[PDB]
Design a binder for these strands. Structure first.
Ligand SMILES: [Zn+2]
Lengths: 100, 83, 94, 208
RNA sequence: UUGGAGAGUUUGAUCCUGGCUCAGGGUGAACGCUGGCGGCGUGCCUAAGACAUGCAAGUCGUGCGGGCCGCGGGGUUUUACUCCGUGGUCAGCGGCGGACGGGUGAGUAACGCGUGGGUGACCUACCCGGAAGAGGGGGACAACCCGGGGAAACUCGGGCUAAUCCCCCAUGUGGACCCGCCCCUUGGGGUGUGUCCAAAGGGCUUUGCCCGCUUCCGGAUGGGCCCGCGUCCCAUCAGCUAGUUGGUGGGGUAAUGGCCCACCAAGGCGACGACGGGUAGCCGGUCUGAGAGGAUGGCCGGCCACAGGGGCACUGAGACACGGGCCCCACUCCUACGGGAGGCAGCAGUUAGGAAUCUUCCGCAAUGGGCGCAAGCCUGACGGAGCGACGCCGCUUGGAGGAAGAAGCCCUUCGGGGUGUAAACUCCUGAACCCGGGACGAAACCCCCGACGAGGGGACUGACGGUACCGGGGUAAUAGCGCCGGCCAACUCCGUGCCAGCAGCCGCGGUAAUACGGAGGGCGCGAGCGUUACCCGGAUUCACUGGGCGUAAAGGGCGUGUAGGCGGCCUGGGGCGUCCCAUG
RNA sequence: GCCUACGGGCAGGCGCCGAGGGUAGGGCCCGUGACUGGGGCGAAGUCGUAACAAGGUAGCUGUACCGGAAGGUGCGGCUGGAU
C-alpha cells in the first residue's frame, strides 16, 4: 500500500513542486502523553494547480528529484492560511535566538 | 539453483540433521527457506526421520535439485513413490 | 608466486578489445545516421539507421549489450531521427 | 572435593541428631548423646542470640549437610525447584528425595546415606534394568531401583537386607527384599517427610 | 496477579536531608595460593602493527590443436620417413566456478541497520515448466616453429592451425525499437504496417538415447532503487547550503534519480536541534533487574562495511572484485642502480605491543560447495584431535565399625576442656592400573534388474580410533584458598606496643588488641578459593512506573507576552488518537 | 601507421573530470614547554582576632574605596539580631 499523508502546502516558490506540512500524533515512547510532531514533504504538481494554504493528500511515488518522491493526490480543504501562519511565525522566530 | 539439503544441528559427536530447502549459495547452518523434516544419523529415537512429502513435492516440482544423500532420505519417506 | 586463475585476465583483454570495437562501431554509425537526417537524406539516412539497428541488436545477442541496453539505443536513435525528418518530410525507404 | 571428613561433629554443630553414620548414631554415640555442645574450644560457652541471618543460615546447612551435597548442586536444585509450579519448598525436598543415592538409602540397600553413594559409584545398583554410578541421578516414579546380580552375595548388602525384615519402607516406596528389588512409587509429600528442618527458613535464606 | 530482604557512616544524644560504602548476580578475563578426572563450550578484548615457511580454488580430454618422455601396431624385402592406437606429463585455446564459502570491524549517526511496505522505475547464471528452432558460407589467435630486447620479472616481432572461440547469410515460433489505434491507467496489456535479431556440437549401448545449443512466456530463488516509523552524547556547536533546492532537455544504468552535464529559476534545511564536534558496525539476543528500565551486542545466525592508504575500470547473470587488473602513496626485499617483487583482517605460526588469548596437528569418513555423464578432482567450508581449570556440568580422594576416649599441638580457674571417631586398628568396596571384546555414526552416488521412472538387488567407503562402550582382574589411592571487630557464619593465647602493620566503609595499633603477626580453634566454599577490573543491582540517588524546591541543594529580581502545552455546559456529523474482531 | 568486403575497426593524439603535489592565506585538534594564578591536602610555627554568646564596634550582604592580615569604612538592603 503506497503511503498516503495529509498535509498542507506551505511553500509555493518552486517549480512544479510544493512543500507540504504533515503533522503526525503519538504517545511518547516513555512518558505517555500525546506528542505532536511533523515533517515537510516536497510534493509534486505537474499542472501547477495546488496553491498555498491548501490541504492535500500525499502519496508515495516514483522518485523524481533528489528528495522529491511524492506526488500530490487530491485537494482536501482549500483556503486555510491559519495553519501556514503558524509555520511562518515559527520560521520567523528562528531569526532571533543567536550569536550575531 | 535452490537445493534441498541437511543442516548440522547436533553437536560434537551428536549429529542431528535438518532437511531443508535453500538457495545453493547459502551456508550449511545458514538461513534456510522452508524446514521440511529432520533426520537423525545415529537413530536414537524410533522417530529418526520425518518429511511431509506434501511440501517436498512442491519444491522438486518448482525445481529444486536435492542433495545425493538428501534425496536418499526423501526416497525412504516415499517422496517419489508413484504406485 | 603463480596462479592459473589469471588466464581470465589474459581472457578479459580479449573481450575488452572484442566489446570495444563493437560498441564504438555503433556510436560511429549512429553519429553517422544522425547528421544525415540533419541534411534531410531521407533515403540514405535510414539505409544507415538500418545498419545501425542491426549492429545494436547484434551486440545484444552477445555480452556486449546489457539487453534492454540495445533497446534504449534503438529508441534514442530512431526517435532522434523521425523528429529531424520534419525539417523536410517524406521518408523514402521505410 | 565432595566433603568427606569428620562427621558426627556436624550431628554436633546443629544440635539436632544427624543420622550420618547409621548404626552407631543409635548406640550411645552420634555424640549428641553425652556431648551435645558444638565443636571448638568454645563449645561449652554460653551462645549469644543468633542474628536472623544466622538461623536462616544454620537451617540451610542442616538441610544441606543431611543430604551431604555440595552447595553448588544444592543451590542448583533449589533454583530448579523455584521454576516448577508448586510450593517452592515442598518441591525442593522433592528432587532432594528423588536422587538415586538417596533412594537407595531409603530402600534400605545401605546403612547410611554416605554408604549409599559408594554403592552407586561402585555400581552395585540397577535402575530399571541398567546399572548406574551417577548418584545425583533423578529417580523417576515407577523405576525398579535394584542391586546388580553381581553384587547380590555381598557381606555388606546381605547383612543389611537381613535387617529390613523388621522396618516399614517409606510410604512412597515398595521393595521385595526376597529379590532385593524396589520401586519408586510417587514423589513423597511434605506430610510424609520426617526431617527436623523448616524449609521456610531455607527458602527465606535464598532471597538475601 | 507464582513477584520487590537491606546495613555501616555526620550527634553528647534525636530525627530528617544527603553522599560515600557493602552484601547479590555476571564476564571471550587477568594476577596470586592450590591443581586429580571426564563431557560439552570457548580462548588476541590490545598495534586494521609488521610478517619467513607451507597449505587456503579450481576443475572438465564425452568442447579443439599440440609439446615433452615412452610402449604396442601398420606402409617399407631393409634403411631414413611416416600412418593408428595408447600410457604418463605439460601447458594452451575454449566452458563453468573464481562475485560462494573463510576473515575482520577500520570506517560509518547513515534508509547503514531494525520494522512495514512500494517497484506502471528493475535484473536475475545454473534449476523447473511450457512453446518454437538448430539451414548455408567464411575468419582470427595460442600452443607449436624462426628471430630480436632484458640482470631479472617478463617482453617484442614474424609464420602455421582446430574448436562447443569469432564473423556473415537465410528461417522466425517468437522477441526489440518507431508510429497508429483498443484497454488499462505514472515505462501495465492487446493489436496492425516498417525495420532489426537466432543458434554447436560432443558421447555412446550411433537410425536412437544421453549431455549440451537458440528465441520466447511463466516459475522459483537471489538482488538493485525507493518510502513511512525507530535509531548515542555536547547548544560552553545555532544558524547550515551553490549542484545547493527545484524546472527543461540530454547522458548514463537493469532501473527511478542532480547520480552526471548544459541551460533556466531561487531555492532547500534548521530549537519537532540544521551545521559542528565526540563516540559506536546494527539486529535476533545476552547480562541484570519485581518491573519499568539500564548495560551490552565477541562465540551462533541475519544485514552492512573494509580486505596496507587513495583513485579507477575491465570481464562478466553478478565485482568495481581479500589469494584479478591499471595508477599514485607509505613501507619491505632483489637490483648490472635503467628497473622490479611483494600484502595472513584464511588456517597454523613468527615477532611486536600487552595484564592476557592455543597446535606450523588428523581427515576429506560425514555435511556443504565447485567442476564433471561418471569414475573423480579440489574443499585449512567442515568433521575431528590437541593445548588453557578460561566457563559450565558430572566424578574421585573411600564405606561401616571403632575410647567416657592414645599421642602430639592448643587452652585452663590446673581439677579439666579441646582437636576427636578424627587417628591407630578391624572388616568391606574398589578410581587408577592390567588382560580380552570393540561401536553407531554410512548409506548413497556407482553397478545390475526393471522403461537410465517407481520399485527391487549388488559393491565400496571412516579422520575420531582401538577411542565410547561391554566382560573379566585389580591397588584405600590429590586438597586447597578465604575468612573469624560491625555489616558478616566463625574466638582463645602468645608476640607486639600510634611501631610493624591492617583496611571496602566506620576504624584498629601508644604494654590487658575477639581488628597487626603466628598458633589452637571455628565458619564458609571445594579442584578450587581469593584479588583486581568492568556491567546491572541495591539507588524511588535522574524519580514513566517512582523525587523534589519556606529554613536541608532548589522558584527565574518583576512584568509583558511569541512559539508551545493545557482548557467550561448541551446537541449532531466525521472518526484522526483510542478500544474490539479477523487476517498477513 | 596497422587491418578492410572501403561501410568501418585498432594504434596514436588532444580534451574534461580526476587520486595526489606545489604556493599563499585561514581555521581547528594532539605533544613538549620557559615564564606564571590559585587550589586542595597534612601534623604543625609565626602575627593578629574576623566569626560563633550583645564574641565585647549585632551579623549577613551588592557595591565602592582602602589596608601585614584577617578586615575597616561609605551607601543601600535583610533578620537568618541579644535586651
Ligand atoms: Zn553420628
Amino acid at each position: 500500500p503506497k503511503k498516503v499523508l495529509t498535509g498542507v502546502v506551505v511553500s509555493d516558490k518552486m517549480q512544479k513542486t510544493v512543500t507540504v506540512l504533515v503533522e503526525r500524533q503519538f504517545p511518547h515512547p516513555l512518558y505517555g502523553k500525546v506528542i505532536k510532531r511533523s515533517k515537510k514533504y516536497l510534493a509534486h504538481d505537474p499542472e501547477e494547480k495546488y496553491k498555498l494554504g491548501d490541504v492535500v493528500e500525499i502519496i508515495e511515488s516514483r522518485p523524481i528529484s533528489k528528495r522529491k518522491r511524492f506526488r500530490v493526490l487530491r485537494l482536501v480543504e482549500s483556503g486555510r492560511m491559519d495553519l501556514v501562519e503558524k509555520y511562518l511565525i515559527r520560521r520567523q522566530n528562528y531569526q532571533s535566538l543567536s550569536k550575531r | 539453483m535452490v537445493k534441498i539439503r541437511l543442516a548440522r544441528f547436533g553437536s560434537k559427536h551428536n549429529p542431528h540433521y535438518r532437511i531443508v530447502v535453500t538457495d545453493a549459495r547459502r551456508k550449511r547452518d545458514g538461513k534456510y527457506i522452508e524446514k521440511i523434516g529432520y533426520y537423525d544419523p545415529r537413530k536414537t529415537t524410533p522417530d529418526w526421520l520425518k518429511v511431509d512429502v506434501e511440501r517436498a513435492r512442491y519444491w522438486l516440482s518448482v525445481g529444486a535439485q536435492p542433495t545425493d544423500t538428501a534425496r536418499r532420505l526423501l526416497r525412504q519417506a516415499g517422496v517419489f513413490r508413484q504406485e | 608466486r603463480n596462479l592459473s586463475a589469471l588466464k581470465r585476465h589474459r581472457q578479459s583483454l580479449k573481450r575488452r578489445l572484442r566489446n570495444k570495437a563493437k560498441k564504438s562501431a555503433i556510436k560511429t554509425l549512429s553519429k553517422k545516421a544522425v547528421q544525415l537526417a540533419q541534411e534531410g537524406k531521407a533515403e540514405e539516412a535510414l539505409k544507415i539507421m538500418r545498419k545501425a539497428e542491426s549492429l545494436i541488436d547484434k551486440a545484444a545477442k552477445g555480452s556486449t549489450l546489457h539487453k534492454n541496453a540495445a533497446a534504449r539505443r534503438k529508441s534514442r536513435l530512431m526517435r532522434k531521427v523521425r523528429q529531424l525528418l520534419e525539417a523536410a518530410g517524406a521518408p523514402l525507404i521505410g | 572435593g565432595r566433603y568427606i571428613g569428620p562427621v558426627c561433629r556436624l550431628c554436633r554443630r546443629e544440635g539436632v541428631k544427624l543420622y550420618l553414620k547409621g548404626e552407631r548414631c543409635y548406640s550411645p554415640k552420634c555424640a549428641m548423646e553425652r556431648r551435645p555442645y558444638p565443636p571448638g574450644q568454645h563449645g561449652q560457652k554460653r551462645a549469644r542470640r543468633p542474628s536472623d541471618y544466622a538461623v536462616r543460615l544454620r537451617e540451610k546447612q542442616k538441610l544441606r549437610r543431611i543430604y551431604g551435597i555440595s552447595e553448588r548442586q544444592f543451590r542448583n536444585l533449589f533454583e530448579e525447584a523455584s521454576k516448577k509450579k508448586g510450593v517452592t519448598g515442598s518441591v525442593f525436598l522433592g528432587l532432594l528425595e528423588s536422587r538415586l543415592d538417596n533412594v537407595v538409602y531409603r530402600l534400605g540397600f545401605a546403612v547410611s546415606r554416605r554408604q549409599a553413594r559408594q554403592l552407586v559409584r561402585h555400581g552395585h545398583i540397577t535402575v530399571n534394568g541398567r546399572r548406574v554410578d551417577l548418584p545425583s541421578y533423578r529417580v523417576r516414579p515407577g523405576d525398579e531401583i535394584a542391586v546388580a546380580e553381581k553384587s547380590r552375595n555381598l557381606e555388606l548388602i546381605r547383612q543389611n537386607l537381613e535387617a529390613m525384615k523388621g522396618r516399614k519402607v517409606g510410604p512412597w516406596l515398595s521393595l521385595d527384599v526376597e529379590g532385593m528389588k524396589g520401586k519408586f512409587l510417587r514423589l513423597p509429600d511434605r506430610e510424609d517427610l520426617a526431617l527436623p528442618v523448616n524449609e521456610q527458613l531455607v527458602i527465606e535464606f535464598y532471597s538475601r
